Amino acid sequence: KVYNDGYDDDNYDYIVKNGEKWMDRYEIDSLIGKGSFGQVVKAYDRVEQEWVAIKIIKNKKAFLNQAQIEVRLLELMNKHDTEMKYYIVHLKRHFMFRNHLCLVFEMLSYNLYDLLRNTNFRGVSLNLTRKFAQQMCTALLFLATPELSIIHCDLKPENILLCNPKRSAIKIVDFGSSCQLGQRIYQYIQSRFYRSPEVLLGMPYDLAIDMWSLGCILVEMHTGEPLFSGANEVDQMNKIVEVLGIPPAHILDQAPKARKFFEWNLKKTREYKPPGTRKLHNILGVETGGPGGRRAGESGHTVADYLKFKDLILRMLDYDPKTRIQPYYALQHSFFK
Amino acid sequence: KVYNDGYDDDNYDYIVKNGEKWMDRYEIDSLIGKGSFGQVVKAYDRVEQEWVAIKIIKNKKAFLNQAQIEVRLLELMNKHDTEMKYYIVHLKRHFMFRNHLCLVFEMLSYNLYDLLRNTNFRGVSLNLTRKFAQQMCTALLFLATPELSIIHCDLKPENILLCNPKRSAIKIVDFGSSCQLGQRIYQYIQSRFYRSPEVLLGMPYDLAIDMWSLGCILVEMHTGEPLFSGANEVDQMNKIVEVLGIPPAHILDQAPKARKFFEKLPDWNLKKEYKPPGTRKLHNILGVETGGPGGRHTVADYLKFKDLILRMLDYDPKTRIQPYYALQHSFFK
Amino acid sequence: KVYNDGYDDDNYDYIVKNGEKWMDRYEIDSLIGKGSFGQVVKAYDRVEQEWVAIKIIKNKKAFLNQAQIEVRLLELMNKHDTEMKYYIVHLKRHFMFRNHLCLVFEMLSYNLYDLLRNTNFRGVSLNLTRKFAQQMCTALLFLATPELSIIHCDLKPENILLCNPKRSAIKIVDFGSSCQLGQRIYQYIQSRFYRSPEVLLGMPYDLAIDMWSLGCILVEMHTGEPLFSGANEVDQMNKIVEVLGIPPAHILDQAPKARKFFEKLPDGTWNLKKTKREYKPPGTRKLHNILGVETGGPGGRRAGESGHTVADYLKFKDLILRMLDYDPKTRIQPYYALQHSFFK
Amino acid sequence: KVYNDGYDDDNYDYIVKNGEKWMDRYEIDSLIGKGSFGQVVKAYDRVEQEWVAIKIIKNKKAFLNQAQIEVRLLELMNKHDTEMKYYIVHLKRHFMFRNHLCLVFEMLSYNLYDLLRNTNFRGVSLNLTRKFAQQMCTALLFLATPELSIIHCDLKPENILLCNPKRSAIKIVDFGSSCQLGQRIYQYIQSRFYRSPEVLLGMPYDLAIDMWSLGCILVEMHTGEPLFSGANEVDQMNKIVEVLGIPPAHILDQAPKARKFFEKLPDGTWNLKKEYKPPGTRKLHNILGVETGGPGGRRAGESGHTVADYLKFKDLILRMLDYDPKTRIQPYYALQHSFFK
Ligand SMILES: COc1cc(N2CCN(C)CC2)ccc1Nc1nccc(-c2cn(C)c3cnccc23)n1
Ligand SMILES: COc1cc(N2CCN(C)CC2)ccc1Nc1nccc(-c2cn(C)c3cnccc23)n1
Ligand SMILES: COc1cc(N2CCN(C)CC2)ccc1Nc1nccc(-c2cn(C)c3cnccc23)n1
Ligand SMILES: COc1cc(N2CCN(C)CC2)ccc1Nc1nccc(-c2cn(C)c3cnccc23)n1
């Protein structure tokens, strides 16, 4: 009947009420989002006189434990002196409130999915895509610091936040699904649209899976639409193969879930486009004025520009994670010069 | 639309299909129960030719990691040579199936709540209650092994399983909420009816919380009704106070949440239906001098029982009776 | 031949050179101490403009991992804002230098064994002992903060430091042997003289083992001499029994190591085994007489001295006896020790 | 003064007495060896009627804690039901005895350094080297098993044991310095002669540092002498550079410790800082004696030591001594090498 003396629903979520003041300090304004972990609220800090985002974890042991891993990773990152850490949304403090762990973050404006919707799903400019890609490669380089070696594991537009609607600064958020290179047992990871082929295949995975997600995200930021909009894992792999063809034989040979998708030929599941015929050259509109032709003529949307972007994306979407382009090298690509 | 290639529902629980066969080995029979962790199914192991219970953990990282702790706690117990470990439901093995961690257990008949439902919540005899108590005390001694130091954290009739409807053998099940002794991390623990005063007061705690729970369970097994049926935390502490009086001053002086329930005076009293403190005497609840709960062992037997419960319901976790000493209690001789 | 490019000796200790400067910051002065962990040096911090003690961990994987536990415990403590934190030697920072983990502590003056030595092992006054007692009880109260639940595990005079040669402030140092309350990992813990009976008996233990050690240390600080100076574990437990009697049968009935020290007789009672070595009968070496409660204190040297009346000694005796309770479940806890009349 | 009731010396080592019987089961025979961890003894198991080797960990917390990692890693191995875990010295069981953690291993006969001494530091044949290299590659493949991902971190002749003078079997021993692949914790790792360049340069590293050690060891096994006998880290890097040349610039551009050994010129190129042979001029071709009858010319005309055979060996070693840990040969591919055909 009642849960947590009435403060929780039956999903161990705190019943969010606008206007409440948690710890007589944080005035709850509205809900930012919901997740399996719990909720995120926009709140005004009446002590520091600033807006914050507060992540209120479900009042359940499994979700508290997960959130404690996130806190530890965030606090581990914060001991690093590099300016590269500023591409990670900063955890200000945390506290227990009515049996919920609450994480207080610096508040950003909205996420890149909001941004895509604000473009009516037709993309942002290649120039803004470049600024994004350079920041994200820099964030991924930070995560790759050996003492960290952190895999985000859930990169997607929802988990990249824009600081200020009038600027291009972005940051990565939500390390609740993350792990360090030494803590990997879970093989069903990443959001499906952004799921790397080594994961779909059941292979060893490392930080390179985030680079695969980055490549998918960057294409979607410029076209406005998900690159690989799989409805399931077979559909996901088929939509990958439409663009990138049949994976290398040496990979599929060592792939435990190869025959889930392939016979090396593709197995049959309306009909999908043949392998490689959905060329990225055409998706990007390299010689045809960008996505939908809408970028014809705009500065920094030349053939030379688009070819450089296609090359970087293709290096990010390498089938093999041992030769997938790595953050240090990605930052030196001509696309950024 | 779909989840886990259609194998999962929207909460990422495996969609249980009665009669399905896993890996030409486990034939799913029926659902045993649901929960936050996921689901428990009755299944036949065609290879071993035995019935098993399979706990199918939800296909989500948070519950996978929790269930890993539970697996580790169970595999720690397996290593111990003592016969005491057999009062714990045995984990036979675990495997990944369609992205769900599956824990395979030995199969038991039903839980103590079902038993209480069977008796129309009139409780079982003191002799059956005596038998359950010694088994439970032995299970708690095993958890108290210093190298384990495991706190079950959710002892209750539903988590106590009956082997055979024709037998008194029982076992503790479900260590998904369990932890080993350590620095305090979680404060909102135990099921409310069975939650210890140290937890409610926000105080340090240890394996003694499980002994508190056991005392509530044992009285409930014999009366048929929960000892402290709180609708909320304040209702819970007040129903404890009805029976055991105001907590000792030295406890509330340290209790961080003392003033959620009590108020300190210039000279400790309750804050505001309830019976005055201590007037709901366990002497009357057990029917010690009046036959038993309602009207039907000896009065010496009931006095020995009452003494044992009162030691289990010691407000002080430092002096609450420990498993080794409870087994030496005259109630069992 | 050469170790760590010459910077280490064959023990992979850093070869300390007086007057070296590290990282254009720390001016190495002299060696403070040495242990199996490595070394402790006195150094001047040019940035904070203050003296520090730098613990230089051996350049060896096993000792590095050990010290990382110690770093974690200290940093876990540093997150607590209570004043009681003052009574732990403070970790200022840590760094890697020439493959050595270095822990930078506030510099204190000397340890309580030095102080004992400086009394020619005749003790300090009951007034100074009282001050030490109250501070150490506060330290233990801090360690018992539930989020911490830290057992020091090697409380002894050498691990209590005097802050300033002309003040009475003391602090607990060296958490390299420490652990948080949890499942039992270690059984051979605590220095022998200060080792609690539950450890000697191979029993479960918790934070109460540090209180036992404090009981022994406070007596020694006042008398000058260790209360239980065991040459080996059997001698240690016999000397304990001299003062406090046979441990209760319900403890011995559970102790895995009871038969190292005691015999269960045909009448069910426990008695000492003969030593394969002459002890007073159990409990006839009374702490009342060790302290000299009615005869002028230890060796009669406190007769007539302010603060050393029979009433003062009786309160001190009482607190110590609660600290030396055989049962860790009823041994006095730091909160209640601090309410004792000895401090009123 | 007395340590551990007289059972220990002042280094917290158990005082081993030949003959002692532990727990009416293990009869101690003699000291096999000793290291910073403690000691190894040969012992006879009466209850099981078999001879065993017991690693007696020092009675000190830091060594106890290190050895619990070792138990954990070994017990992880043991759970893998395969034939390849045989190339690891098998942990039979463990127990605490008089305050010492004790690891009970199957017992082997001697280590690779003893064999080298028995050759008079002239090396074993290319045929025996081939067999050892195949087993060692199979051990590294097992370690590379994804759920294990175990870096041994201290591959050296003393940690490779011969199973018996008449049986060609060798096994890897001592996982007390080992770790699973993960975030970087230690940087000063591996014995100096066998220490990989990525370690020397302070870079990220993974299981490939063991492959580097194996390449160094395999050469030493055939010649009898260490390939890179650095007296210190600079001497080490400079002897590596003697045989292999200056590392690639893209490594050095990212190496935190590059300027300990190399100077970056105004044209952006890397040279050695301020002795030695010029880089790349100490040819492995000439150390192996590909054309002159092998080491010392002693193998001239011997079966299995043709020009072709030595070229297959040079090539494989050179693949194991790839400066770049991403392109260094890996146990799977090392095992398909023609040198084993
Ligand atoms: C007004 O601010 C925001 C608005 C929005 N919304 C999303 C919905 N649309 C419809 C409106 C715009 C989205 C994010 C923000 N702000 C922001 N700043 C810091 C942290 C987080 C945060 C979000 N998530 C899922 C997290 C998970 N873990 C940790 C932290 C976070 N969010
Ligand atoms: C037919 O068998 C049973 C029937 C029942 N029911 C309960 C409902 N009433 C209405 C009918 C009778 C309940 C349990 C069993 N058997 C049994 N045996 C081993 C393990 C588990 C088990 C249950 N749970 C929640 C777990 C959680 N974690 C691990 C293991 C378990 N259960
Ligand atoms: C001049 O300063 C001192 C002198 C002395 N000596 C002891 C010998 N007698 C003969 C002279 C006086 C003893 C301690 C100090 N100072 C001090 N201050 C902070 C930390 C530590 C420290 C010591 N140890 C073993 C540690 C282990 N872990 C961590 C920290 C420490 N020491
Ligand atoms: C008589 O047997 C041996 C003799 C020798 N010696 C080495 C000196 N030369 C001069 C003589 C021959 C060397 C090894 C063995 N046997 C053997 N068998 C099992 C385990 C181990 C073992 C060695 N180490 C360092 C370990 C570290 N961790 C775990 C286990 C081990 N060793």
Closest CA to C313 of C127, C148, C173, C184: C127
Angle at A77 between CA A76 and CA A83, to 5 degrees: 150
β D91-97/C50-57 pair status = unpaired
Q: Do the annotations mark residue A271 as ligand-binding?
A: no
Q: Which of C186, C188, C231 lies at the smallest CB-CB distance from D2?
A: C231
Task: Answer yes or no: is the C-beta of A114 below 6 A from any ligand 1 atom.
Answer: yes
Q: Give me C78's structure tokens.
A: 């540093």
Q: Give bridge partners of residue A41 from the DSSP assignment.
A: A31, A54
- Alpha carbons within 13 angstroms on the beta-carbon side of residue C271 total 9
Closest CA to D155 of D87, D92, D94, D223: D87
Task: Answer yes or no: is the C-beta of D161 below 6 A from any ligand 4 atom.
Answer: yes
Q: Whose CA is nearest to atom 14 of ligand 3?
A: C110
The C-alpha atoms of residue C192 and residue D154 are separated, in whole angstroms, by 36
Q: Whose CA is nearest to atom 16 of ligand 2?
A: B108
The C-alpha atoms of residue C179 and residue C148 are separated, in whole angstroms, by 10
Q: Give me C146's structure tokens.
A: 């539930």
Task: Report CA Rg, chain A.
Answer: 21
The C-alpha atoms of residue A124 and residue D88 are separated, in whole angstroms, by 56
Q: Give bridge partners of residue C150 from the DSSP assignment.
A: C180
Closest CA to C90 of C177, C172, C180: C172
The C-alpha atoms of residue A40 and residue A34 are separated, in whole angstroms, by 6
Angle at D317 between CA D316 and CA D321, to 5 degrees: 120
B79 shares contact with chain C (CB less than 8 Å) = no
Q: Are D284 and D306 in contact (CB under 8 A)?
A: no
Contacts of B262 (CB under 8 A, 6+ apart): B246, B247, B252, B268, B269, B270, B271
Ligand index nearest the alpha carbon of residue B112: 2
The C-alpha atoms of residue B148 and residue B206 are separated, in whole angstroms, by 13
The C-alpha atoms of residue B165 and residue B188 are separated, in whole angstroms, by 34
Alpha carbon separation from B2 to A240, B9, C302 (Å, rounded): 19, 8, 85
Q: Which of C4, C59, C62 lies at the smallest CB-CB distance from D62?
A: C62
Using DSSP's 3-state secondary structure scheme, residue D142 falls into helix
Say what the alpha-carbon torsion angle D161, D166, D167, D168 is, to the nearest 10 degrees: 70
Contacts of D41 (CB under 8 A, 6+ apart): D16, D28, D29, D30, D31, D32, D53, D54, D56
The kind and range of the H/E element at C35 are strand C26-35
The DSSP secondary structure of A289-337, one letter per residue, reads TSGGGTTTT-TT-SHHHHHHHHHHHHHHT-S-TTTS--HHHHTTSGGG-
The DSSP 8-state label assigned to residue A274 in this structure reads: P
Q: Whose CA is nearest to atom 2 of ligand 2?
A: B109
The DSSP secondary structure of C216-277, one letter per residue, reads HHHHHHHHSS-SS--SSHHHHHHHHHHHH-SPPHHHHTT-TTHHHHEEE-TTS-EEEPPP--
Nearest residue of C to residue B185, measured between CA atoms:
C147
Question: From which experimental method does this structure derive?
Answer: X-ray
The C-alpha atoms of residue B78 and residue B92 are separated, in whole angstroms, by 10
The answer to whether the Cβ–Cβ distance between C2 and D231 falls below 8 Å is yes
The C-alpha atoms of residue A171 and residue A165 are separated, in whole angstroms, by 13
- Chain B hits for C180, Cβ within 8 Å: 182-183
Q: Are C204 and C198 in contact (CB under 8 A)?
A: yes
The answer to whether the Cβ–Cβ distance between B182 and C182 falls below 8 Å is yes
The pair phi, psi for residue C262, each rounded to 5°, is -130, 160
Taking the CA of residue C1 and the nearest CA in chain D, the distance in Å comes to 8
Q: Give me C157's structure tokens.
A: 């005079």
Nearest residue of D to residue C236, measured between CA atoms:
D5
| Dihedral sign of CA atoms A240, A242, A248, A249 in order | positive
Q: Are D104 and D94 in contact (CB under 8 A)?
A: yes
The pair phi, psi for residue C106, each rounded to 5°, is -55, 140
Ligand index nearest the alpha carbon of residue D66: 4
Q: Are D182 and A182 in contact (CB under 8 A)?
A: yes
Contacts of B48 (CB under 8 A, 6+ apart): none
- The amino acid sitting at C80 is H
Q: How many CB atoms lie within 10 A of CB D291?
A: 12
- Chain D hits for C188, Cβ within 8 Å: 4, 59, 99
Taking the CA of residue B4 and the nearest CA in chain A, the distance in Å comes to 7
SS3 of D238-294: HHHHHHHCCCCHHHHHHCCCHHHCEEECCCCCEEECCCCCCCCCCCHHHHHCCCCCC
Using DSSP's 3-state secondary structure scheme, residue D127 falls into helix
Q: Give me B269's structure tokens.
A: 């009293």
Closest CA to B155 of B205, B207, B92, B109: B207
The C-alpha atoms of residue D201 and residue D209 are separated, in whole angstroms, by 12
Chain center to CA of B295: 28
Closest CA to D240 of D190, D206, D173, D289: D190
Percentages helix, strand, coil for chain A (3-state, rounded to 5) are 40, 15, 45
Q: Do the annotations mark residue D199 as ligand-binding?
A: no
The kind and range of the H/E element at C52 are strand C50-57
The DSSP secondary structure of C151-184, one letter per residue, reads E----SGGGEEESSTTS--EEE---TT-EESSS-
C149 shares contact with chain B (CB less than 8 Å) = yes
What are the catalytic residues of D? 154
Closest CA to A33 of A135, A98, A113: A113
Q: Whose CA is nearest to atom 3 of ligand 2?
A: B110
Q: Are B159 and C160 in contact (CB under 8 A)?
A: no
Q: How many CB atoms lie within 10 A of CB B264?
A: 12
The C-alpha atoms of residue C240 and residue C234 are separated, in whole angstroms, by 10
For ligand 1, the distance from its centroid to the CA atom of residue A160, given in whole angstroms, is 9
| Per-window interface: D 243-272 vs A, CB < 8 A | 254
The C-alpha atoms of residue A222 and residue A128 are separated, in whole angstroms, by 9
Q: Give me A259's structure tokens.
A: 């025959």
The C-alpha atoms of residue C168 and residue C172 are separated, in whole angstroms, by 14
Is residue C154 annotated as a catalytic residue, yes or no?
A: yes
The DSSP secondary structure of A16-52, one letter per residue, reads --TT-EETTTEEEEEEEEE-SSEEEEEEEETTTTEEE
Taking the CA of residue C21 and the nearest CA in chain B, the distance in Å comes to 40
- The amino acid sitting at D157 is P
Using DSSP's 3-state secondary structure scheme, residue C43 falls into strand
What are the catalytic residues of B? 154
> What is the resolution of the experimental data for this entry, in Å?
2.1
Q: Which of left, alpha, beta for A203 (phi over 0: left; psi -120 to 50: alpha)?
A: beta
Q: Whose CA is nearest to atom 30 of ligand 2?
A: B174
Closest CA to B213 of B171, B269, B162, B159: B159
Q: Are B91 and B74 in contact (CB under 8 A)?
A: yes
D245-264 burial code (b ≥16 CB/10 A, e <16): ebbeeebbeebebbeebbee
Q: Give me B54's structure tokens.
A: 């399979």
The DSSP secondary structure of D68-90, one letter per residue, reads HHHHHHHHHHHTS-SSGGGGB--
β A100-106/A50-57 pair status = antiparallel
Task: Answer yes or no: is the C-beta of B42 below 6 A from any ligand 2 atom.
Answer: yes
Scan for tokens 């940093």, then name that residue. C75
Q: Which of C154, C174, C210, C312 is catalytic?
A: C154
Q: Whose CA is nearest to atom 19 of ligand 1?
A: A107
Q: Which of D183, D254, D326 lies at the smallest CB-CB distance from A149?
A: D183
C181 shares contact with chain B (CB less than 8 Å) = yes
Task: Answer yes or no: is the C-beta of D105 below 6 A from any ligand 4 atom.
Answer: yes
- The amino acid sitting at C238 is N
The DSSP 8-state label assigned to residue C79 in this structure reads: T
Q: Give me D183's structure tokens.
A: 């975030």
A175 shares contact with chain B (CB less than 8 Å) = no
E-assigned strands of chain D?
21-22, 26-35, 38-45, 50-57, 91-97, 100-106, 110-111, 150-151, 160-164, 167-172, 179-180, 262-264, 270-272
Pocket perturbation via mutation, ligand 2, pick of B77, B107, B110 by most ligand atoms within 8 A of CB: B110
The kind and range of the H/E element at C21 are strand C21-22
The C-alpha atoms of residue B230 and residue B239 are separated, in whole angstroms, by 7
The answer to whether the Cβ–Cβ distance between D61 and C186 falls below 8 Å is yes
Sheet holding C160-162, edge to edge: C110-111, C160-162, C170-172
Nearest residue of B to residue C76, measured between CA atoms:
B183
- The amino acid sitting at A200 is L
For ligand 2, the distance from its centroid to the CA atom of residue B31, given in whole angstroms, is 9
Alpha carbon separation from B286 to B116, B282, B297, B301, C17 (Å, rounded): 16, 6, 12, 11, 77
β B269-270/C110-111 pair status = unpaired
Q: Give bridge partners of residue C104 from the DSSP assignment.
A: C54, C93
Domains of chain A: 4-81+89-106 (3.30.200.20), 110-336 (1.10.510.10)
Q: Give me B113's structure tokens.
A: 């709540």
Using DSSP's 3-state secondary structure scheme, residue A231 falls into coil
- Alpha carbons within 13 angstroms on the beta-carbon side of residue B223 total 22
B324 shares contact with chain C (CB less than 8 Å) = yes
- After what residue numbers is chain D broken, C–N > 2.5 angstroms? 274
Contacts of A56 (CB under 8 A, 6+ apart): A13, A14, A16, A38, A39, A40, A41, A97, A100, A101, A102
Q: Are B60 and A36 in contact (CB under 8 A)?
A: yes
The C-alpha atoms of residue D137 and residue D172 are separated, in whole angstroms, by 11
Alpha carbon separation from C129 to C71, C126, C133, C227, C281 (Å, rounded): 30, 5, 6, 15, 29
- Alpha carbons within 13 angstroms on the beta-carbon side of residue A256 total 8
Angle at C137 between CA C133 and CA C143, to 5 degrees: 150
Q: How many CB atoms lie within 10 A of CB D205?
A: 24
The C-alpha atoms of residue B72 and residue B78 are separated, in whole angstroms, by 10
B/D touch flag: 3 or more CB pairs below 8 Å: no
Q: Give me D221's structure tokens.
A: 């096994």
Task: Answer yes or no: is the C-beta of D39 below 6 A from any ligand 4 atom.
Answer: no
Alpha carbon separation from D228 to B166, D183, D217, D263 (Å, rounded): 75, 28, 10, 22
Q: Which of B181, B250, B318 lies at the smallest CB-CB distance from C182?
A: B181
- The amino acid sitting at D232 is N
Chain D contact partners (≥3 CB pairs within 8 A): A, C
B188 shares contact with chain A (CB less than 8 Å) = yes
β B38-45/B50-57 pair status = antiparallel
A314 shares contact with chain D (CB less than 8 Å) = no
Ligand index nearest the alpha carbon of residue B55: 2
- After what residue numbers is chain B broken, C–N > 2.5 angstroms? 267, 272, 296
The DSSP 8-state label assigned to residue C139 in this structure reads: H
SS3 of chain B: CCCCCCCECCCCCECCCCCCEECCCEEEEEEEEECCCEEEEEEEECCCCEEEEEEEECCCHHHHHHHHHHHHHHHHHHCCCCHHHHHECCEEEEEEECCEEEEEEECCCEEHHHHHHHCCCCCCCHHHHHHHHHHHHHHHHHHHCCCCCEECCCCCHHHEEECCCCCCCEEECCCCCCEECCCCCCCCCCCHHHCCHHHHCCCCCCCHHHHHHHHHHHHHHHHCCCCCCCCCHHHHHHHHHHHHCCCCHHHHHHCCCHHHHEECCCCCEECCCCCCCCCCCHHHHCCHHHCCCCCCCCHHHHHHHHHHHHHHCCCCCCCCCCHHHHHCCHHHC
Closest CA to D59 of D20, D15, D100, D24: D100
Task: Answer yes or no: is the C-beta of B110 below 6 A from any ligand 2 atom.
Answer: yes
- The amino acid sitting at A39 is Q
Task: Answer yes or no: is the C-beta of C73 below 6 A from any ligand 3 atom.
Answer: no
